[PDB]
Amino acid sequence: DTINAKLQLVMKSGKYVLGTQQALTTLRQGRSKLVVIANNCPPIRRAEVEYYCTLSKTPIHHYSGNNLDLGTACGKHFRTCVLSVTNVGD
Amino acid sequence: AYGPNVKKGDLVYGVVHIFASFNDTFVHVTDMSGRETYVKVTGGMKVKADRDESSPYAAMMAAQDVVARCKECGINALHVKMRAVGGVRTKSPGPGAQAALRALARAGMKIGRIEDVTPIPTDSTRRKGSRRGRRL
Amino acid sequence: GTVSRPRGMRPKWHKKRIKRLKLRRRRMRQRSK
Amino acid sequence: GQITEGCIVCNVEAKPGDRGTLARASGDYCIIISHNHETGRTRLKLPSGQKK
Amino acid sequence: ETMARKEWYDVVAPANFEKRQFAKTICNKTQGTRIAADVLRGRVFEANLADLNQSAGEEEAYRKVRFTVQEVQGRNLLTQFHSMEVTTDKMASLLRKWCTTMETTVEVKTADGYTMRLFVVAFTKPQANQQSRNCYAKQRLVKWLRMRITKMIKRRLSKVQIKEAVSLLTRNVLSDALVRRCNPILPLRELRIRKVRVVRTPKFDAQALLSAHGTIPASVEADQR
Amino acid sequence: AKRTVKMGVMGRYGTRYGANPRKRAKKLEVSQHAKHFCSFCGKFAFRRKAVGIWRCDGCSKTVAGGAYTLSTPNNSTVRSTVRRLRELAK
Amino acid sequence: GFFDADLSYPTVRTERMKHKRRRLVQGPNSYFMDVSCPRCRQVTVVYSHATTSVECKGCSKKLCRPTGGKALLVEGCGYRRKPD
Amino acid sequence: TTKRRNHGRSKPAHSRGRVKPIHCFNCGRLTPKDKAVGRFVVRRMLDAASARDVAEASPVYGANFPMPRLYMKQRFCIACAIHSRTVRARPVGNRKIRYT
RNA sequence: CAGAGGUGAAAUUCUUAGACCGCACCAAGACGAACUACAGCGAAGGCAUUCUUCAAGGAUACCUUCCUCAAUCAAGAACCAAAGUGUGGAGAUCGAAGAUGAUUAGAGACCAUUGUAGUCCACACUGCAAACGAUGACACCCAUGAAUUGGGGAUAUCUUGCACGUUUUCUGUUUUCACGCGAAAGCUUUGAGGUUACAGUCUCAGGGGGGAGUACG
Ligand SMILES: [Mg+2]
Ligand SMILES: [Mg+2]
Ligand SMILES: [Mg+2]
Ligand SMILES: [Mg+2]
Ligand SMILES: [Zn+2]
Ligand SMILES: [Zn+2]
Ligand SMILES: [Zn+2]
């Protein structure tokens, strides 16, 4: 429950992007603090995102929930595969 | 003279199973594994009427027949196992349980250890009769 | 031994009689209609 | 011989190398009952309810 | 004639027991293809522990030991431990009306490949100055006692052979250790091993059986009159 | 408005074939034509093509099984059993 | 005996054996303590019935184990009840 | 007319809904476990006279080793308990006396 | 190896083609003895082997938060022993219907040996019980001594943190004609008390016995 508790704090005071393309953009720009990935995700896409995170030395977290569960826990009404935090105020 | 090779005063042990219900009584002598049978005499083999099969007298008569044939076998001392019907039925022994044991001792046989072996269920299937029971 | 004086006949059997009567009436009305 | 007892299987060959002859119709299966290592034989319960 | 065909044999216990030849049995003589040895193997013999150990401690008189025949050697039957049980009269006299009865089942594997199942029974007791009418135990303590017993038995019995494990079950060696270590959790009136049974055995090994039996006494059943 | 009181899809049969056979077939007909949940995607996207064949509307997945529903109750028990037995093996 | 009881002015013996909400005027049961530290020797104010985690600043920070009633104090600290 | 305060059983108002039934020892009638009459019985296997003859013939059973006994828990229906003299009817004023 | 079963006594029934009995096993389906009680849990119906696991529920403790958000009910909704119904499984035990022996003037019954539906599981219906404490829900006052289940506060015994001893406390759950009430039986901090000295709040039902819970809708 700790990650669900922290994500709401980020949504209150922070900045983020949703989606693989925007997450990779923030990783290339080196303006990202944490990446979160859902448990159902194609292995190729998961492998690419983790490769970028390793190469950039960025903390990465496995959500253990569905992409629908991650989308709900984000306060949104749509499914999300990847979340990228670019500013955390808490 | 089919006994084993032992001294004249040695004790050779067997096991007797005494099954005494309220309709009959069994006197059954085996070895310590229960696989070989020496003699088996019942109370219905000594009386002529059905109502007398469970009498203490019928049980005593059956026991004396067992002792006579055991001398041929070569058996001298008998361990005793006793039981009632058990299961989901009654757990109390029949009238001939005590008479059979006493007759064996008084006939010259040595008595070893005694144990009750009535079947006892940890949990059980429903018994006969209705929920109202037997109505007399 | 556990009950007072009923009148008529055991009430459960009386109810069973009435039940059979109603079934027969239902069948007769069904045949006519 | 490598499948643990109690497992549910399909497409079973009665003789080795026949490429599958038992439990093939839709929704059907066999149950593995026991192994015997001395004789190298496995016991199965078939869809019909027979043992083989 | 029934007794024309019968030959006498002797049943021998393993070397853990002071009385080796403890029972006598009969069998058919070999006729044609019916060999007497193959029907003799596999039989189970029951005996009282007090008789085998030739003691009068009043605690061994309520235990029975069973042995299974594994090989025939002339007119001697070589056996191995099968199971041990407390007699029914003793077990039924330990139950009390206003206390808690706790039971545990433990499965352990020895070093020789033998698998055993153990059944343990324990009873609560009231303290010296207690005035309460009952002595029921709380469920949390009962579960804790069950967990400790399972840990202790699985640790001691997984490092010994089938012969040493039998030696521990007899002489009440394992029982005293359990009572001493379980009293701090709960005041125990009595703790007993009600039954121990072998549920799996390894493959037959002729040399292993001979080592367990040590020096085998001779039989005189075939000797000339 | 409702257009029917309890006949549903079976309204195409008029007064033919009997009430109990119609009621028994309706339950399987509804399931056969429903949209089922795709665990790879996270959306309700599986449709039956022919008996036993289920195709996802967005992703290119085809799955086998069920004949009138995506998964039969016996198959879930088999899945849990297989997973536990493999967990013992490994 | 031989002495009556005034409901308005009860005795100390009777008033002490009462639930906190059954007294003439209800009031708290808890208090505050000044607590030292193991091998650190700092000062912290701790509630007598604390249920959250109370930690020493700049130290091992393990004290005040919570229970179903009063909290337990680790043996490495000295405690003193504060007034009022 | 209510005859007994406890209604002949051991189930007060706000305690329990249902108690599992058991079979009577003699007739087999099903009755709730809290209503059946229960006794514990510890009877000698043999009578006093016959015990002496068996003890004389026994190398095991002497004076410092007693013979085994039978332990049974018995529960009866109301009718079977009365006929078998286990429990008898008492005057109105004496129905309250309870032993242990 | 010569009978076993069953009964008040017997007979239907099984048995030298080996029954009954004895020992160790294998299969399948139910059930969880003794410990088990005027004990615990649940809204009621109900709930008893062990281990792992998921979401709940109550009480207790608090110098935490909030600030009237509550009580009780037509309409409307959910759950509800057993028997019974539909579709798939299962089928050990017991056993409505039925069959065969006995009792009897008769015996279709009670007794004996059997046996189909059922009894067990999944999903879908049914909505009835002496579904009883024959006692609607919420709130106040009330005599004494016990006992007992869970939590908390204060200060002798035993094992090596647990249990126990004494005294208080909150919640539950019971037992010894309290005042008083009632036609009585009886109830009594837990009311059936605090009512002609008749008013705390809401709600369901009854009005001599049948016809009848029947007829019609
Ligand atoms: Mg009820
Ligand atoms: Mg039912
Ligand atoms: Mg009759
Ligand atoms: Mg039958
Ligand atoms: Zn898809
Ligand atoms: Zn510090
Ligand atoms: Zn009875």
Side-chain angles (χ1 to χ4, degrees), chain E residues 2 95-97 99 101 103 127 129-134 136 138 141 146 183-185:
Chain E
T2 296
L95 272 93
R96 202 144 302 167
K97 171 77 178 278
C99 64
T101 308
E103 293 160 278
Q127 294 281 22
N129 57 339
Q130 184 159 351
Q131 307 289 326
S132 327
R133 320 209 83 261
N134 65 69
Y136 298 134
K138 311 175 71 57
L141 299 187
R146 190 172 289 123
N183 197 24
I185 302 188

Side-chain angles (χ1 to χ4, degrees), chain B residues 17 23-24 26 28 30 33-35 40 42 44-45 50-51 53 83 89 120-122 124-129 134-136:
Chain B
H17 311 259
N23 277 331
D24 207 14
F26 287 71
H28 189 353
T30 71
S33 66
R35 290 272 286 253
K40 193 247 290 176
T42 70
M45 284 157 62
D50 291 16
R51 79 190 71 81
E53 266 143 50
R83 72 160 276 192
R89 284 183 273 176
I120 309 267
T122 55
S124 88
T125 58
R126 184 176 185 116
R127 43 139 311 151
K128 92 180 313 223
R134 188 166 185 257
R135 273 110 64 197
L136 284 189

Side-chain angles (χ1 to χ4, degrees), chain B residues 36-68 70-97 99-118:
Chain B
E36 298 281 335
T37 284
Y38 298 112
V39 189
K40 193 247 290 176
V41 179
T42 70
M45 284 157 62
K46 325 290 311 165
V47 297
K48 263 176 159 294
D50 291 16
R51 79 190 71 81
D52 301 322
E53 266 143 50
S54 57
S55 65
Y57 191 63
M60 162 207 281
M61 281 345 274
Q64 327 201 129
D65 269 8
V66 157
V67 175
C70 285
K71 281 158 145 93
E72 173 262 15
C73 296
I75 271 61
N76 343 123
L78 270 159
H79 285 303
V80 188
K81 290 319 133 328
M82 292 240 30
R83 72 160 276 192
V85 179
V88 293
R89 284 183 273 176
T90 194
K91 313 266 175 312
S92 35
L101 187 45
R102 192 184 203 191
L104 292 164
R106 297 257 303 134
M109 303 271 327
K110 260 73 193 76
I111 302 302
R113 330 208 90 110
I114 305 158
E115 171 126 350
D116 180 83
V117 288
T118 299

Side-chain angles (χ1 to χ4, degrees), chain D residues 12-25:
Chain D
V12 192
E13 28 187 55
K15 49 234 292 171
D18 81 35
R19 301 174 78 172
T21 48
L22 312 169
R24 306 176 59 188

Side-chain angles (χ1 to χ4, degrees), chain E residues 2-58 60-215:
Chain E
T2 296
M3 284 249 176
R5 337 184 285 256
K6 307 305 176 137
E7 286 171 328
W8 293 88
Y9 287 81
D10 261 295
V11 197
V12 180
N16 317 42
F17 310 90
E18 310 155 359
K19 211 208 218 203
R20 303 299 295 281
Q21 290 164 343
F22 66 96
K24 280 179 163 49
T25 191
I26 69 174
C27 189
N28 273 335
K29 51 203 323 160
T30 274
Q31 228 64 33
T33 42
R34 185 72 84 110
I35 312 300
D38 52 46
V39 292
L40 274 168
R41 261 184 317 264
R43 295 190 179 177
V44 177
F45 289 87
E46 202 217 80
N48 190 282
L49 182 56
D51 292 331
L52 276 98
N53 269 346
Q54 309 282 357
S55 74
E58 286 83 31
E60 331 203 32
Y62 299 110
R63 310 239 288 278
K64 330 165 268 205
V65 191
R66 292 184 181 91
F67 300 99
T68 182
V69 170
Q70 302 227 275
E71 191 41 283
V72 192
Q73 192 199 238
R75 305 285 261 250
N76 269 302
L77 309 174
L78 268 47
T79 57
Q80 168 77 301
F81 174 84
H82 179 269
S83 62
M84 191 178 63
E85 203 147 355
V86 174
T87 70
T88 157
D89 42 86
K90 178 62 178 178
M91 200 42 30
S93 77
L94 292 171
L95 272 93
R96 202 144 302 167
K97 171 77 178 278
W98 304 98
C99 64
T100 296
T101 308
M102 316 159 248
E103 293 160 278
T104 309
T105 302
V106 180
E107 277 257 50
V108 66
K109 202 185 189 344
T110 73
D112 316 348
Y114 288 86
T115 311
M116 311 168 122
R117 213 184 313 269
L118 284 293
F119 302 92
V120 182
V121 190
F123 307 89
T124 38
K125 81 168 150 183
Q127 294 281 22
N129 57 339
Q130 184 159 351
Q131 307 289 326
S132 327
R133 320 209 83 261
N134 65 69
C135 51
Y136 298 134
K138 311 175 71 57
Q139 225 53 37
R140 174 171 62 83
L141 299 187
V142 172
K143 290 162 113 300
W144 189 14
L145 196 133
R146 190 172 289 123
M147 176 255 288
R148 174 163 302 206
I149 288 186
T150 319
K151 250 206 71 151
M152 220 170 298
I153 291 184
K154 284 181 135 253
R155 186 192 37 172
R156 177 155 294 106
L157 273 196
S158 34
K159 324 183 325 273
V160 300
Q161 311 257 126
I162 201 44
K163 196 206 244 305
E164 292 71 299
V166 169
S167 213
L168 289 179
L169 291 175
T170 313
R171 306 150 221 220
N172 270 116
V173 167
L174 182 55
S175 266
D176 309 311
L178 293 174
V179 184
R180 151 159 22 92
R181 290 298 318 277
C182 287
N183 197 24
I185 302 188
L186 262 161
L188 293 188
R189 196 220 322 166
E190 178 137 23
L191 184 141
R192 300 295 217 88
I193 296 181
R194 182 181 64 79
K195 180 181 179 178
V196 34
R197 187 164 69 88
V198 174
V199 301
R200 202 131 37 197
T201 66
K203 221 205 179 49
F204 176 72
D205 187 2
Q207 298 299 144
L209 175 69
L210 266 203
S211 147
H213 268 273
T215 285

